[PDB]
Amino acid sequence: MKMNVESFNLDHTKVKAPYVRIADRKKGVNGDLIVKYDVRFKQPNRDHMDMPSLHSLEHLVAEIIRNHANYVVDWSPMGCQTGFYLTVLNHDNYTEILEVLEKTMQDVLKAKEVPASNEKQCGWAANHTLEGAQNLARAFLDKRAEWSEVGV
Amino acid sequence: MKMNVESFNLDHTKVKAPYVRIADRKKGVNGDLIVKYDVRFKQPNRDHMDMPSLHSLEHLVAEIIRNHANYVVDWSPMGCQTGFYLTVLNHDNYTEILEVLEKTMQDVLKAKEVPASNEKQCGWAANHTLEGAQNLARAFLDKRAEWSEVG
């Protein structure tokens, strides 16, 4: 059957994390294209990101990717804690997305702090960690070569 | 200082959960609209949702809401665990959003299982709870008359 939600149609047991998958392409009535990418850090049901590191990598990448790209719509963590969804508008070169992510992960490692990590600009300012975030980004980076190998 | 990220520009110490807030807008070069809504379940830095309940609510609303619309681009949980982001395409009607969210939450209470809570369709299948999700859905619903008052 075809599920209502795109990711419910992905066989999680066959993908090989880490990877960047074209999860969805929507073209608006006016022709504008919206593309969604499943950037998986951990292997489904085999591992996951602890919330403090996940939460910080969200602030860091959300803020930084937008320095390297003018077409980012959103960067949101998955509830399953194994990855993030990246949404872009009017951009459709898979390779350029990997380079943008690459440049972005590199700047995460050179970070000296986690952006807007206080009670004025965050709903849980306490739950943060730059080290964990950076640990996640380095690990993701170390397998850059495998990014386009989704596995299924 | 204005951050690249729009929610970083929201003064979290002046909002009052629960609430549904028009958080962002973007328009393609061809005219297509994208509106993102900040739907806050918990008071910032004063409370938060536990992951299993949040995870289950992600699944439930994500499937249930698209049974009621056909313009939903995405239903995503926030890293801070206090709310979700609702993204829509070519739909600019705040009132309808509240009603759809009202209908969605009601169906969530009639749900018998968290959909797709298995290892083939979920990245952490064991981390779920239907009841937990239904408890967040009931609370959110009880305070319905407040949804439009963000400040």
Ligand code: MET
């Ligand atoms: C709280 S970090 C910002 C997350 C949001 N989904 C965005 O990319 O704008």
Ligand code: MET
């Ligand atoms: C894991 S439920 C799917 C969530 C995703 N943000 C969507 O709206 O499709």
Ligand SMILES: [Zn+2]
């Ligand atoms: Zn935050």
Ligand SMILES: [Zn+2]
């Ligand atoms: Zn899941």
